[PDB]
Structure formats: C-alpha cells, structure tokens
Amino acid sequence: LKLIGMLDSPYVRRVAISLKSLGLPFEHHSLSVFSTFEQFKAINPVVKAPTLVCEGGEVLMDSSLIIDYLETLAGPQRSLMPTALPQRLRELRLVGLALAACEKSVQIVYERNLRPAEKQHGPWLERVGGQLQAAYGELEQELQKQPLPRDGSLGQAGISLAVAWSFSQMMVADQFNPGQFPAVRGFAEYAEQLPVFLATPAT
Amino acid sequence: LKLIGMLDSPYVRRVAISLKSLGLPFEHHSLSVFSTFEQFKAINPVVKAPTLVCEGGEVLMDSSLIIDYLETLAGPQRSLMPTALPQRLRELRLVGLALAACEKSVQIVYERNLRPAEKQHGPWLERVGGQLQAAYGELEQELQKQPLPRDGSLGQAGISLAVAWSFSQMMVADQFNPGQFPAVRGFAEYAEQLPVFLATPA
Numbered sequence: 462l463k464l465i466g467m468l469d470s471p472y473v474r475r476v477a478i479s480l481k482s483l484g485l486p487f488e489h490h491s492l493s494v495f496s497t498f499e500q501f502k503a504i505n506p507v508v509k510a511p512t513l514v515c516e517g518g519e520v521l522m523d524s525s526l527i528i529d530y531l532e533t534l535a536g537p538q539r540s541l542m543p544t545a546l547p548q549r550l551r552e553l554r555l556v557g558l559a560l561a562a563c564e565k566s567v568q569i570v571y572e573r574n575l576r577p578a579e580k581q582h583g584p585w586l587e588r589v590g591g592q593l594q595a596a597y598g599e600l601e602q603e604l605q606k607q608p609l610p611r612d613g614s615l616g617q618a619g620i621s622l623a624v625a626w627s628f629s630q631m632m633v634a635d636q637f638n639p640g641q642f643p644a645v646r647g648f649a650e651y652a653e654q655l656p657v658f659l660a661t662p663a664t
Numbered sequence: 665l666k667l668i669g670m671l672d673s674p675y676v677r678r679v680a681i682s683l684k685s686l687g688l689p690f691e692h693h694s695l696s697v698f699s700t701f702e703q704f705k706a707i708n709p710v711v712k713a714p715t716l717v718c719e720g721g722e723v724l725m726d727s728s729l730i731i732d733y734l735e736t737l738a739g740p741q742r743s744l745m746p747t748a749l750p751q752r753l754r755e756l757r758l759v760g761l762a763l764a765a766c767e768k769s770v771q772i773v774y775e776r777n778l779r780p781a782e783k784q785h786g787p788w789l790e791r792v793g794g795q796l797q798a799a800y801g802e803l804e805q806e807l808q809k810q811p812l813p814r815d816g817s818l819g820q821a822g823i824s825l826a827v828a829w830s831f832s833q834m835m836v837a838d839q840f841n842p843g844q845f846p847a848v849r850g851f852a853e854y855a856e857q858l859p860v861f862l863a864t865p866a
C-alpha cells in the first residue's frame with residue numbers, strides 16, 4: 462500500500478494515522494499536489510491528496526473513502542468506528558465537524574496563497590472564517606457535554622479532531638486566540654503526544 | 665429523518681437518492697446555504713449542505729458520512745455498497761472519482777458566481793477544469809473496462825456518477841465537447857430515466 466500526499470494536509474494525515482492505528486503497513490510518498498504537480502499527476506491524474514495506491518495498483522482518493530477501504534481490509538476487529546447506532550452517530554457527527562473545520566481552514570489557505578491579493582475576496586473569507594468558528598464551536602459543545610476518552614487508544618473522531626485542530630493552528634492561527642476552544646485544544650494536545658501522532662508529524 | 669439542502673447540489677442529491685434507494689423515509693427541507701443562510705444556520709451553525717437531522721435531533725454533515733449513517737440504519741441487506749474487497753475497492757474508486765468531479769464542478773461554479781469578474785483567477789479555473797476532465801476521463805476508462813448494470817437497480821457508484829454527470833452538464837457544460845465520455849454520459853442519461861431519479865429532480 463502507498464499513501465501519496467504531504468502530512469501537512471489534514472486529509473493525508475488522518476489517513477496516515479488511521480493506517481497505523483489499523484495495523485496496516487504502507488509506504489509514504491511525500492508529494493505535493495501543487496509543487497510536484499507532474500509527479501503527483503503521474504500517479505493520480507485528478508491530482509487530489511491523499512491518494513492511496515492499493516496492492517494491485519488500484520488508485521483511490523478522498524480520505525473518507527480511503528479509510529472505508531482500509532477499514533474493510535483490516536476487518537471489524539480493528540475498526541476505528543463504533544457500530545452501535547447512538548455511538549456511531551456521535552462519532553460521525555464529530556468527524557463531520559472536524560472535516561468541516563479542515564475544509565474551511567484549507568479554503569482560507571487557498572484563498573490567500575493561490576491567487577494575488579487583488580483577486581482575494583473579503584466576503585468569501587468572512588463566510589468561511591465564520592463557518593470555521595462554528596465548526597470548532599460545535600465540537601467544543603460536544604466535548605464539554607461528553608469528554609473523549611484518554612486511554613491511549615483512538616477512534617476516528619479522536620484522530621480527525623486532533624489532526625484538524627493542529628492543522629488550523631499551523632495554517633490559519635490568525636482565526637484563533639489563546640484559551641479559545643479549551644476542550645478541543647486540550648484533547649488535540651493530548652493526542653499529539655500519543656506514539657502514533659508523534660510518529661506521524663504534520664511537519 | 666430530515667434532509668436539509670437543495671437538490672441542485674450533487675452532494676444533497678446523492679443523499680436524497682441514497683435515502684430512497686435504501687428505503688428510508690424522510691422529510692426534505694429545500695434550503696439554500698446562500699439564499700437562506702440564516703434559516704440554514706439555525707439548523708446547522710456550520711451551514712453545509714447536505715445536513716441530515718436524525719430522529720433524535722442529532723445533526724450530521726458531509727454526504728459520505730451521512731450515507732455511512734444511513735447504511736447503518738438500513739442494514740446490510742439494503743446496502744448500496746459491495747462487501748467483497750475487490751468489488752468494494754472498485755466501487756470506492758468510482759465514487760471517489762465522481763465526488764472529485766462534483767468538487768471541481770462546484771469550484772468552477774463558486775469561482776464564477778461568488779466573486780465579481782475582477783476577483784476571478786484564470787490559473788485556478790484552468791487547473792480545476794483540468795482536474796474535472798481527468799476525473800471523467802478516469803471514470804470513462806473504468807466503465808469501458810466493466811460496464812455498469814442496467815437492471816433498474818443502483819449502487820453508490822451508479823448514484824454518485826449519474827448525479828455528478830448531470831450536475832456538471834447543468835452547471836459547467838462549457839467545459840465539455842459533445843462526444844466526450846460516452847459511457848459516462850450514457851449511464852447518467854439511463855439513470856436519469858429511472859423512477860428514483862425522476863422522482864428526485866435536480
């Protein structure tokens with residue numbers, strides 16, 4: 462198995478940590494969809510990261526679909542997802558919120574770095590920034606109501622939430638202030654000291 | 665169950681058709697993340713469509729996660745996904761390509777409508793347009809290799825691919841030449857005449 466993409470992308474990182482958490486060995490090819498376009502295009506012409514090349518050479522994209530494939534390959538015993546409806550529903554909500562925070566953080570990065578200042582649109586940044594704040598706000602309320610376990614093991618919500626938070630702090634820190642979203646920050650900083658996160662640095 | 669969003673969004677439409685295909689009843693609330701921002705924000709502060717409000721009131725977002733939840737409620741017998749690894753791998757590859765097509769199509773729409781002319785960036789549109797072509801090119805090769813069944817039934821790949829194609833032709837047709845991707849076009853046009861697609865207009 463081969464994971465194509467840079468770990469500074471939260472989508473690539475959540476897959477990398479999911480792979481390790483599921484016990485599936487793999488090769489990591491650190492390629493950028495922007496600075497090594499041709500090299501990435503040679504593997505996946507759609508040029509989307511993460512891209513997973515399976516044992517037979519099949520190419521997959523989209524972090525959630527890649528993880529669905531990995532979950533299938535690993536078997537139910539290793540699932541990072543609860544199966545009971547209530548519990549799974551909650552997990553899906555947390556992952557959804559975390560992925561929304563990822564999407565909005567990335568949209569801000571793209572708006573500011575992929576086009577000249579003159580073409581940057583204030584109303585767009587305002588909207589996206591508000592959505593980013595809402596996402597972490599919802600996550601904060603969920604965690605304040607029901608804290609995540611800190612037992613050395615991780616579920617998809619924990620992985621995705623930690624990866625998302627650390628990414629936002631690295632790339633769009635100007636959207637945050639010290640002490641903000643204490644529950645989310647607290648869990649992310651706890652997760653970042655777990656062996657699997659330490660072995661998969663974003664940078 | 666309540667589905668919040670407009671069917672012109674391929675992400676919302678894929679969920680709507682998945683719901684019907686899984687046999688799960690639901691209420692459809694046709695709300696726009698743009699023209700009815702506040703109303704949508706009151707239901708989901710993040711303002712992302714589709715949003716699914718569960719029986720208990722829980723709010724879920726992201727079409728793939730929503731469908732995962734729905735697959736769970738519906739049970740294995742109703743699954744729109746193959747379980748055997750080789751077949752599930754292919755299905756996931758097809759869905760991934762379809763969603764990539766949706767993403768790039770939406771990005772072109774956003775670039776051309778959420779900012780005035782002088783804010784539009786040509787290099788970005790050219791990049792995204794190229795990725796859109798690549799997504800359907802890959803899908804076309806997959807279909808030529810193994811055609812999709814036309815027995816009135818649908819899998820997630822079929823639903824997502826058809827919704828993606830129809831969306832692209834409706835919103836960014838200027839990116840396509842008529843003879844391109846005949847197998848993809850062919851399947852989408854077949855699917856659109858199926859009862860579930862006719863009962864769920866975009």
Ligand SMILES: N[C@@H](CCC(=O)N[C@@H](CS)C(=O)NCC(=O)O)C(=O)O
Pocket residue numbers: 470471472494508509510511522523524525567
């Ligand atoms: N739904 C995808 C989103 C991945 C994504 O937007 N990746 C970025 C890197 S952070 C990218 O490939 N940008 C290249 C492009 O869209 O041109 C996932 O969860 O993998």
